[PDB]
Design an enzyme around this catalytic site. Structure first.
Site, PDB file in Angstrom:
ATOM      1  N   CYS D 119       0.802  -1.219   0.000  1.00  0.00           N
ATOM      2  CA  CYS D 119       0.000   0.000   0.000  1.00  0.00           C
ATOM      3  C   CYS D 119       0.842   1.279   0.000  1.00  0.00           C
ATOM      4  CB  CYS D 119      -0.993   0.020   1.168  1.00  0.00           C
ATOM      5  SG  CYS D 119      -1.971   1.562   1.220  1.00  0.00           S
ATOM      6  N   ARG D 122       0.429   4.631   3.023  1.00  0.00           N
ATOM      7  CA  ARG D 122       0.654   4.312   4.431  1.00  0.00           C
ATOM      8  C   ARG D 122       1.082   5.458   5.346  1.00  0.00           C
ATOM      9  NH1 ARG D 122       4.488  -0.533   4.411  1.00  0.00           N
ATOM     10  NH2 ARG D 122       4.813  -0.001   2.183  1.00  0.00           N
TER      11      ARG D 122
HETATM   12  C1  HEM Z   1      -5.827   6.592   2.501  1.00  0.00           C
HETATM   13  C2  HEM Z   1      -5.432   6.528   1.224  1.00  0.00           C
HETATM   14  C3  HEM Z   1      -4.878   5.223   0.598  1.00  0.00           C
HETATM   15  C4  HEM Z   1      -4.261   5.206  -0.596  1.00  0.00           C
HETATM   16  C5  HEM Z   1      -3.997   6.425  -1.502  1.00  0.00           C
HETATM   17  C6  HEM Z   1      -3.875   3.844  -0.879  1.00  0.00           C
HETATM   18  C7  HEM Z   1      -3.206   3.424  -1.994  1.00  0.00           C
HETATM   19  C8  HEM Z   1      -3.116   2.111  -2.351  1.00  0.00           C
HETATM   20  C9  HEM Z   1      -2.855   1.622  -3.688  1.00  0.00           C
HETATM   21  C10 HEM Z   1      -2.607   2.514  -4.922  1.00  0.00           C
HETATM   22  C11 HEM Z   1      -2.866   0.284  -3.641  1.00  0.00           C
HETATM   23  C12 HEM Z   1      -2.635  -0.672  -4.839  1.00  0.00           C
HETATM   24  C13 HEM Z   1      -3.925  -1.454  -5.115  1.00  0.00           C
HETATM   25  C14 HEM Z   1      -3.891  -2.195  -6.439  1.00  0.00           C
HETATM   26  O1  HEM Z   1      -3.235  -1.701  -7.405  1.00  0.00           O
HETATM   27  O2  HEM Z   1      -4.547  -3.283  -6.535  1.00  0.00           O
HETATM   28  C15 HEM Z   1      -3.141  -0.108  -2.263  1.00  0.00           C
HETATM   29  C16 HEM Z   1      -3.213  -1.397  -1.799  1.00  0.00           C
HETATM   30  C17 HEM Z   1      -3.452  -1.828  -0.523  1.00  0.00           C
HETATM   31  N1  HEM Z   1      -3.887  -1.055   0.542  1.00  0.00           N
HETATM   32 FE1  HEM Z   1      -4.024   1.016   0.402  1.00  0.00          FE
HETATM   33  N2  HEM Z   1      -4.294   3.045   0.178  1.00  0.00           N
HETATM   34  C18 HEM Z   1      -4.922   3.852   1.124  1.00  0.00           C
HETATM   35  C19 HEM Z   1      -5.473   3.400   2.312  1.00  0.00           C
HETATM   36  C20 HEM Z   1      -5.430   2.115   2.847  1.00  0.00           C
HETATM   37  C21 HEM Z   1      -6.044   1.667   4.100  1.00  0.00           C
HETATM   38  C22 HEM Z   1      -6.877   2.560   5.057  1.00  0.00           C
HETATM   39  C23 HEM Z   1      -5.775   0.353   4.255  1.00  0.00           C
HETATM   40  C24 HEM Z   1      -6.166  -0.617   5.408  1.00  0.00           C
HETATM   41  C25 HEM Z   1      -6.626  -0.254   6.616  1.00  0.00           C
HETATM   42  C26 HEM Z   1      -4.980  -0.076   3.111  1.00  0.00           C
HETATM   43  C27 HEM Z   1      -4.483  -1.345   2.908  1.00  0.00           C
HETATM   44  C28 HEM Z   1      -4.046  -1.826   1.695  1.00  0.00           C
HETATM   45  C29 HEM Z   1      -3.691  -3.202   1.399  1.00  0.00           C
HETATM   46  C30 HEM Z   1      -3.702  -4.422   2.345  1.00  0.00           C
HETATM   47  C31 HEM Z   1      -3.298  -3.194  -0.076  1.00  0.00           C
HETATM   48  C32 HEM Z   1      -2.865  -4.400  -0.913  1.00  0.00           C
HETATM   49  C33 HEM Z   1      -4.163  -4.907  -1.560  1.00  0.00           C
HETATM   50  C34 HEM Z   1      -3.963  -6.204  -2.298  1.00  0.00           C
HETATM   51  O3  HEM Z   1      -2.907  -6.854  -2.090  1.00  0.00           O
HETATM   52  O4  HEM Z   1      -4.861  -6.591  -3.092  1.00  0.00           O
HETATM   53  N3  HEM Z   1      -4.790   1.011   2.278  1.00  0.00           N
HETATM   54  N4  HEM Z   1      -3.288   1.035  -1.503  1.00  0.00           N
HETATM   55  C1  LIG Z   2      -5.025 -10.285  -9.889  1.00  0.00           C
HETATM   56  C2  LIG Z   2      -4.745 -11.185  -8.862  1.00  0.00           C
HETATM   57  N1  LIG Z   2      -5.029 -10.878  -7.586  1.00  0.00           N
HETATM   58  C3  LIG Z   2      -5.595  -9.693  -7.290  1.00  0.00           C
HETATM   59  C4  LIG Z   2      -5.896  -8.752  -8.286  1.00  0.00           C
HETATM   60  C5  LIG Z   2      -6.532  -7.420  -7.928  1.00  0.00           C
HETATM   61  C6  LIG Z   2      -5.901  -6.875  -6.648  1.00  0.00           C
HETATM   62  C7  LIG Z   2      -6.769  -5.798  -6.014  1.00  0.00           C
HETATM   63  N2  LIG Z   2      -6.002  -5.040  -5.009  1.00  0.00           N
HETATM   64  C8  LIG Z   2      -6.863  -4.036  -4.353  1.00  0.00           C
HETATM   65  C9  LIG Z   2      -7.418  -3.031  -5.367  1.00  0.00           C
HETATM   66  C10 LIG Z   2      -8.151  -1.963  -4.605  1.00  0.00           C
HETATM   67  C11 LIG Z   2      -9.445  -1.614  -4.966  1.00  0.00           C
HETATM   68  C12 LIG Z   2     -10.118  -0.637  -4.237  1.00  0.00           C
HETATM   69  N3  LIG Z   2      -9.503  -0.054  -3.204  1.00  0.00           N
HETATM   70  C13 LIG Z   2      -8.238  -0.402  -2.867  1.00  0.00           C
HETATM   71  N4  LIG Z   2      -7.658   0.194  -1.822  1.00  0.00           N
HETATM   72  C14 LIG Z   2      -8.373   0.840  -0.896  1.00  0.00           C
HETATM   73  C15 LIG Z   2      -7.420   1.281   0.002  1.00  0.00           C
HETATM   74  N5  LIG Z   2      -6.213   0.857  -0.449  1.00  0.00           N
HETATM   75  C16 LIG Z   2      -6.342   0.162  -1.604  1.00  0.00           C
HETATM   76  N6  LIG Z   2      -7.566  -1.359  -3.548  1.00  0.00           N
HETATM   77  C17 LIG Z   2      -5.606  -9.052  -9.611  1.00  0.00           C
END
Ligand code: HEM
Ligand SMILES: c1cncc(CCCNCCc2ccnc(-n3ccnc3)n2)c1
Ligand code: HEM
Ligand code: HEM
Ligand code: HEM
Ligand SMILES: c1cncc(CCCNCCc2ccnc(-n3ccnc3)n2)c1
Ligand SMILES: c1cncc(CCCNCCc2ccnc(-n3ccnc3)n2)c1
Ligand SMILES: c1cncc(CCCNCCc2ccnc(-n3ccnc3)n2)c1
Ligand SMILES: C[C@H](O)[C@H](O)[C@H]1CNc2nc(N)[nH]c(=O)c2N1
Ligand SMILES: C[C@H](O)[C@H](O)[C@H]1CNc2nc(N)[nH]c(=O)c2N1
Ligand SMILES: C[C@H](O)[C@H](O)[C@H]1CNc2nc(N)[nH]c(=O)c2N1
Ligand SMILES: C[C@H](O)[C@H](O)[C@H]1CNc2nc(N)[nH]c(=O)c2N1
Ligand SMILES: [Zn+2]
Ligand SMILES: [Zn+2]
Lengths: 411, 420, 411, 420
Positions: D119, D122
């Site tokens: 993420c 953070r």
């Molecule tokens: C507040 C503004 C936030 C921004 C701008 C942000 C930005 C991002 C972005 C760009 C990704 C990539 C997602 C993708 O391409 O699939 C991501 C993933 C992720 N975020 Fe955030 N995030 C935010 C808040 C949070 C919060 C509040 C949480 C949890 C409490 C969080 C937990 C995660 C996790 C666990 C991933 C990995 C998701 C996955 O592996 O599918 N994020 N974030």
């Molecule tokens: C292929 C294999 N396995 C997984 C994927 C998609 C991963 C999605 N990651 C989260 C995308 C997402 C959507 C909406 N919000 C947020 N999000 C919100 C806060 N931070 C991230 N992430 C594609």
């Protein structure tokens, strides 16, 4: 990755190179931060089965040097369509024989592997009842025993389907001696088989309540409740134990059966699971004379033998235990040989295994071997395997442990 | 993922719960797919021996050790703890090394022993005499200290466990080394024959001593001279004074002919080629000693084919039929030889333990360790004696093997790294 | 162990099976508890050299389907006897060519590997002097430049002996622009070359002190002190940068050389180390348009191009940088294409790489690939490699980094 | 071989020292010989998803967590710490699980975010609204909680970070699940022509909703219903009240025709299919939400070939020459698309951050983390934006990737496991 692993023998300085380990796809239990080498024990879906089966068929055609052939490809598609349509597949006779021999070849805990290509494979996949298994098992015993000239064999009963129609032999071995708990807490017979014995008695078996009672077979077919069969005693070869010097040794009334047959393992081939696959080879002397006789939790005979040897048992440093241990094993071999029952001493067995191993490195790129089990339970460093570094890893087809049938079966 | 592990004893049915392994920081050599339990010197991704710890390596190794020491004395988080940590960090920062307190050195050495998963004698771990030899600067100085050790440890046959610790590595070019693998061993000679006279294991080291000017008696049990390297210099030869060298002539309680074989061994078993590692510091010369388990001599030293190889010689005198292996003549001779070693040491009043006694004790030690420490790293392949395996209790005892620090490590034989 | 690893392409759902990772013998930098995938950078004894040579020879003989042959066995003896007497060995011409091509093939950070077998190899192992190196390098430049129709090539100077007689090209690339540090702290020219430019000046090179001055060669032969040589200007192909729509672009005065030749890497083949092995292919546009021109620490032109575009540079969210970026990269490609200088756009390049990978998985069982380097520095997810899972591991022969020669060299 | 590790930024030449990775307890999936940095879901030797924690797994995970919590509030070794730890152990021993205090739950949630190496957002980790939904018992109960979340988080366009935590796993037969991958997404329908109307990423899930009784409008931006599984039961459908679903019509600040493309998107990015692991406890339903980075929508959702795939359509309306890749027509449209998304969200006063601004913050975040925590686990492959990479500072930033707990984990899609 690493591609090459070296093993060294510290007696001969010979260094061998292992590439066979690269074919491992199953985990052993260790990690980079902990080794479990001394731990005894560290529902197949369609999706899961295609690749396991492909792995095997490829391996089989590679072995007969017809990899990529029209036959290879044809079998591959037949198997795949067979699993598509019936959610499982059946092995060709050739495949079953190959896979069984290879599971033995891969048994990293078996010191007898030089013999691996010479195995009589009994195909009992048409068996449907418990009396049927009993007939098959009787044929197996008679063949293998061969009047003392033992022959390696396996009997393969039907593979698992849905885990509710399992064939099992409830005996841990085809031939063992019963064990009975005494009111004073001790055990008469073999303490290893007390629980099994109880199940047999509870199932109707009439026990002689002596020291060396051959157990009945408890056979389960198609998932049904197990049935009791007694093996005809003319078919059970036994050897009374005497000593070539000590004439009092026979007075101990010791005996053992000639046929070592494991019956509680699961033979896995190309993802298929044969949960009833009793196999037999022949005895290495120490299995009987060191383990069966001298394990404290087995027949535990060291004290009596030492007594008759009239040894000073007051101090551990007199090695009175060690002296008895040798005479005991001396007798076992002396007795089996005298009655012309196939038996091998631990020196001879271990030398054969080093040879087998060097062969295996030469022709296969390695030999998975479990040092902890391969080194004999007495006189360890005076056998060549003690000084031989070994690699342990898991190859398929394999023999595996499975739960005891009386812990998961509902009547 | 982290979890507690059970080990079972298959005779007693006793089951223990290992938590200590969660603290392991070093590699065993195994992977998830391949077990290397019987490899003597597995690769463990350890840094090259010629290199010295950088700051980035030292900082965490030292904190870890200082933490566990202050933890062991129930002063964790204290001001003393914090200050000691601050001081250790400044030393590393300004000098890229640090010096252990005396207390820390003794604790460290004791725990290296405690952690030696290959030593069956570890119930004795907290009774270790520690000779701090960090002020030593010469080979003759090393000689003096070693004579002290031999004298103290031998104690007229009533052996006492001891370790002598020479100055730690610095730039890697000023190492202290005892070239000898053990303080006391017998020469080995290659004969015109083609045979080997004496101990074949020591043939190379013996050649070096002779190349350095040593005058070999050229017999079967010549005690070797010490070859001592101080401060990265070329090693110098010193003969340990022979009155300090306790020996036991080997004879048998029944066979009168056994003494005629002319066998003997030395009383003091003292390893001298290992590296003592405490808090990232490396003590490349740290000879230590306990007392023999009989099988060490009777089975391995005497009966290994690549050692004194006496099985045939003894079997002859016992008039055994040696035409078939299945007469177990070899095992029969092996037992008698081992009876003789134990009898002889006891007769001369020199501390020795038989394999039954040693292994029962190790089981006790293990149970203690599980209770008070959460486990006990143990290498089953080394702990189980080389004869009569399954009639000792350790054969039936599952063991987890893992590397805790402080530790004893192997290091390259010095004649492979040294420039003259 | 594991034998099979799987990579998935998330755009096409295509799954490939890697077995080539088993051939790996060199470490990557990661452990099971930490991944070093984005870290840029995570003499051989007799005994060390035998196995390295044998491994290479074996793989060489295996590649021409003459493994185990008469010739194979003899070459093995020859090499082993050669090392035993000289503590080193010489590669046959065939082996040198094979190794070079395979180093490229195994270069996990190179996206141009579809061309791997089309490599012109110039054997400069007879070189003895810096002027000799100069002559060889001019050949390479002339040949590879080929009037704009670029040809891949590598020139291999003699291998390391004792480590005190190394051949080195001190230039990081055969063709690069100087960098001069200004009093105010700013840099004229290419900041990445300030240190090297100073060294050059110190050695007596007279700097033009401009924005695009082609550096001289600094050549170290046989462990001696490096010597200066100016590449004949006619051999240095350069492209003035203009935009197909923005007539003001040419007014930026930008230009770039056509020949991208890496000259500071070490080629390792069968234990032998070729410390001077300049190689060249042709440019993917983004190398110049994104990295050379728009790295903050390089020519850093984004602002002035943005200004000339009349963009609102007040807020990052107007994406003026991204807009400028695209226009600059359009200009580079348009410029090279117009002058008939070989160049590949990052779409074509990545499409070809995916095609390459699929070929490699079919005929070799895998393809080491550093996703961090393979995915282009702009427009990542609109290129196919972004969606392609990749496995990174080290195969040999290989190209390796080595320390800058002015940190080791004693004059 | 533990050591501090250095990471370099190659534009600024700033070098940071990583000590935090030494705490890491979970596997990344790499080995020494094979890097798996670009594998989306590497095998990390994690137990079977359908299995529950044993006592032996739970004890050490709980202790590690409670230890880091008391350490965090500077009360390590206190009476409270010792008592809480004893209380947790008694519960595990007695019930084979335990319960988190509200403080511990909040702390855990926040640290899972802080620990999420993928993420980029953070720097906000400490500002997180935790809704404790551990008293929830029904699917309708989940629905209400989820509505509260959407309403709080959306906050009329001024978005706020939030997470709603449902009851933890027990025997794995009573799991709570939001079947939706995100709280708010658009349906996808496979068409007779083989194309997809709507979002192709949601075709399977849409089929499941329709088969369950959902009436599809069969349009291009149909907001999906919630499929909610409470207490191991079959999931139940709930349409989110449309006035709670904030959406933004996409237009271009110069290109008047852009609105005619009919593109729109939703304001609230809420992940709902991940597992929140705190101290061995497993929270299988834990929807969380932050705010969008522009490129998530503009690059991935709209320009991915396997998503809305709008590139050529925008490119035509820009009258670009799409006959050769080297014209970079795709790159051009891409930028324009991402300008439109940012402009649209801003104009509607809906919180959004561009990739330039977001990555500058992450660098700052990293620098803070290294200073106060000794590290920041980061996955470069995910942190670097999917357009204009090397003109963002993170492309040039070396990052170390490791797994810390508490963490957010992947779990199998519910329909691949659920029994009806
Ligand atoms: C507040 C503004 C936030 C921004 C701008 C942000 C930005 C991002 C972005 C760009 C990704 C990539 C997602 C993708 O391409 O699939 C991501 C993933 C992720 N975020 Fe955030 N995030 C935010 C808040 C949070 C919060 C509040 C949480 C949890 C409490 C969080 C937990 C995660 C996790 C666990 C991933 C990995 C998701 C996955 O592996 O599918 N994020 N974030
Ligand atoms: C292929 C294999 N396995 C997984 C994927 C998609 C991963 C999605 N990651 C989260 C995308 C997402 C959507 C909406 N919000 C947020 N999000 C919100 C806060 N931070 C991230 N992430 C594609
Ligand atoms: C032919 C002569 C054979 C000899 C001398 C021999 C020797 C041994 C010995 C000494 C053991 C150790 C048993 C123990 O300590 O519990 C063993 C185990 C084993 N053997 Fe053999 N064996 C022979 C034949 C076979 C055959 C025919 C098979 C199968 C086809 C086989 C497969 C195995 C397996 C799977 C084990 C592991 C047993 C366990 O884990 O409990 N062996 N062998
Ligand atoms: C006091 C009585 C002791 C007994 C009975 C004993 C027993 C043994 C035995 C039988 C071995 C196997 C040696 C071999 O086969 O090569 C061994 C090894 C070892 N012991 Fe001891 N030991 C004792 C004291 C000590 C002491 C005092 C130390 C250290 C301070 C120590 C540390 C070690 C180490 C590090 C090894 C491994 C040696 C190697 O890897 O080569 N032991 N011990
Ligand atoms: C023929 C067309 C070629 C293309 C389009 C191409 C493309 C590329 C690109 C874009 C990079 C990334 C460089 C960077 O970002 O610093 C690269 C790196 C690399 N290439 Fe190629 N290349 C070509 C030819 C070659 C040849 C002929 C060789 C060697 C025989 C080679 C070996 C390498 C190596 C070793 C790297 C890694 C550079 C480093 O780590 O510093 N390439 N290539
Ligand atoms: C505790 C835990 N887990 C397992 C055991 C007993 C395992 C027995 N292993 C095989 C013993 C055996 C008996 C007879 N024959 C053979 N046999 C036959 C051919 N090869 C071996 N093996 C004890
Ligand atoms: C092959 C490979 N690599 C190494 C070896 C020999 C290792 C020797 N181990 C120590 C033997 C020894 C000798 C004397 N005393 C003690 N000793 C004394 C107290 N505790 C152990 N151990 C053989
Ligand atoms: C930062 C940190 N550590 C190292 C570097 C050097 C990167 C150079 N990589 C190769 C760049 C390059 C230039 C010219 N040609 C080629 N080239 C030619 C064929 N393939 C690539 N590559 C930068
Ligand atoms: C604890 C240990 O693993 C266990 O006692 C093993 C040791 N080695 C063995 N080796 C063989 N061949 N058979 C056994 O039953 C055992 N038992
Ligand atoms: C190959 C094998 O690991 C090697 O011979 C080991 C076995 N166990 C041992 N055990 C002890 N105590 N000492 C040894 O030298 C050995 N040697
Ligand atoms: C920190 C990061 O690893 C570094 O900037 C890398 C990223 N990817 C790259 N990719 C290529 N092709 N070339 C590079 O120089 C880099 N630099
Ligand atoms: C194959 C590769 O790991 C995969 O396509 C990744 C690349 N980087 C990513 N980065 C982010 N932020 N989100 C993603 O879904 C992906 N996908
Ligand atoms: Zn292991
Ligand atoms: Zn990695």
């Amino acid at each position: 990755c690493p591609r090459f692993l070296k093993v060294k023998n510290w007696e001969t300085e010979v260094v061998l190179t292992d590439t066979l380990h690269l074919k491992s796809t199953l985990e052993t239990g260790c990690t980079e931060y902990i080794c479990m080498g001394s731990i005894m024990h560290p529902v197949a879906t369609k999706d899961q089965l295609f690749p396991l089966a492909k792995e095997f068929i490829d391996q089989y055609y590679s072995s007969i040097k017809r990899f990529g052939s029209k036959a290879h490809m044809e079998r591959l598609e037949e198997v795949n369509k067979e699993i598509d349509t019936t959610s499982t597949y059946q092995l060709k006779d050739t495949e079953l024989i190959y896979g069984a021999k290879h599971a033995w070849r891969n048994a990293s805990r078996c010191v007898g592997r030089i013999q691996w290509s010479k195995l009589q494979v009994f195909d009992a996949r048409d068996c449907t009842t418990a009396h049927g298994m009993f007939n098959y098992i009787c044929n197996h015993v008679k063949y293998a025993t061969n009047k003392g000239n033992l022959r390696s064999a396996i009997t393969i009963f039907p593979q698992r389907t849905d885990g509710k129609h399992d064939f099992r032999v409830w005996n841990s071995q085809l031939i063992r001696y019963a064990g009975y708990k005494q009111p004073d807490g001790s055990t008469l017979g073999d303490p290893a088989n007390v629980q099994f014995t109880e199940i047999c008695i509870q199932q109707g078996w009439k026990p002689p309540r002596g020291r060396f009672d051959v157990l009945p077979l408890l056979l389960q077919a198609n998932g049904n409740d197990p049935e009791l069969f007694q093996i005809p005693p003319e078919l059970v070869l036994e050897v009374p134990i005497r000593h070539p010097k000590f004439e009092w040794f026979k007075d101990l009334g010791l005996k053992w059966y000639g046929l070592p047959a494991v019956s509680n393992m699961l033979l896995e081939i190309g993802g298929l699971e044969f949960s009833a696959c009793p196999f037999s080879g022949w005895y290495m002397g120490t299995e009987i004379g060191v383990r069966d006789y001298c394990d404290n939790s087995r027949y535990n005979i060291l004290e009596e033998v030492a007594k008759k040897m009239n040894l000073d048992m007051r101090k551990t440093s007199s090695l009175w235990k060690d002296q008895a241990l040798v005479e005991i094993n001396i007798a076992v071999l002396y007795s089996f040989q005298s009655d012309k029952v196939t038996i091998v001493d631990h020196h001879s067995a271990t030398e054969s295994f080093i040879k087998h191993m060097e062969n295996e490195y030469r022709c296969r790129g390695g030999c998975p071997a479990d040092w902890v089990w391969i080194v004999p339970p007495m006189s360890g460093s005076i056998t060549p395997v003690f000084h031989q570094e070994m690699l342990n890893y898991r190859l398929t087809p394999s023999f595996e442990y499975q739960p005891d049938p009386w812990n998961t079966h509902v009547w």
